[PDB]
Design a protein around this ligand. Structure first.
Ligand SMILES: O=C(O)c1ccc(O)nc1
Ligand SMILES: O=C(O)c1ccc(O)nc1
Lengths: 140, 139
């Protein structure tokens, strides 16, 4: 088999690629204005309308705790709203604000630039392949 | 075009890396070793005596985090910190017998983890995923 080299394991490559992409995201959209987590939570609220914590988790693939923290940090900025479930008066329902939608629409071109710079020199087939495989790998 | 975060390469990278980290933690408990500690120990085993620059270049972890991991391991008597006699601003980290024993004990599980991370990819898809993740990091 040969010695074990972590440098050629799929996990090492995943970590390094994710770190590089996070550096690109932070260098293009300043971490001060919006984080990838906050940006994705707001985009989910925009795409699905009013969402509950379970909906935001299942759509955002972020654990309940980090989603709750992001929800607090964004509600403080009047970028999302917290209403009462029209079916469970003891549940939360998160909705998007005009300020939140305005921030999402302001940042979208930068996220597209981030996707393009992250791909780097990959040709179209290689881009489709990497997104296909990263999606296929994230399921049982 | 419309923006879907769900189909952007960053969301997919985050999801894949988080799933692989969950696998790594589900097979190798944090109590024994973290992925960072394991990778630094493997670097010490593969390269011998290393300085902070060598451990960084081999481990792909930022120098400050490498210092933190090295401290957390020297406290556990899994590596040793001897100062080079050819410099005073040079650190020299070496592997201990307990460190090499832990590395050799965990290597089969790290390989099992690499295998579990691959999931249902057929061999061609595996060649492709490692090819693309390596090609994308170089620009
Ligand atoms: O470089 C890393 O952090 C790494 C390397 C191998 C693995 O299985 N998981 C993580
Ligand atoms: O879900 C995330 O963290 C994410 C989503 C999109 C992007 O470009 N980068 C990171």
């Amino acid at each position: 088999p040969g010695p074990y080299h972590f440098s050629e394991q799929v996990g090492h490559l995943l970590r390094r690629a994710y770190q590089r992409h996070v550096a690109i995201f932070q260098q293009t959209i300043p971490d001060s204005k919006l984080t990838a987590a906050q940006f994705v939570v707001l985009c989910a609220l925009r795409d699905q309308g009013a969402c509950s914590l379970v909906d935001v988790v299942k759509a955002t693939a972020i654990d309940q705790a980090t989603v709750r923290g992001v929800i607090e940090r964004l509600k403080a900025r009047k970028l999302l709203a917290v209403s009462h479930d029209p079916a469970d008066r003891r549940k939360v329902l998160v909705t998007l604000t005009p300020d939140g939608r305005a921030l999402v629409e302001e940042m979208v071109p930068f996220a597209e630039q981030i996707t393009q710079s992250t791909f780097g020199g990959l040709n179209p087939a290689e881009r489709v392949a990497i997104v296909y495989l990263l999606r296929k790998m994230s399921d049982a």
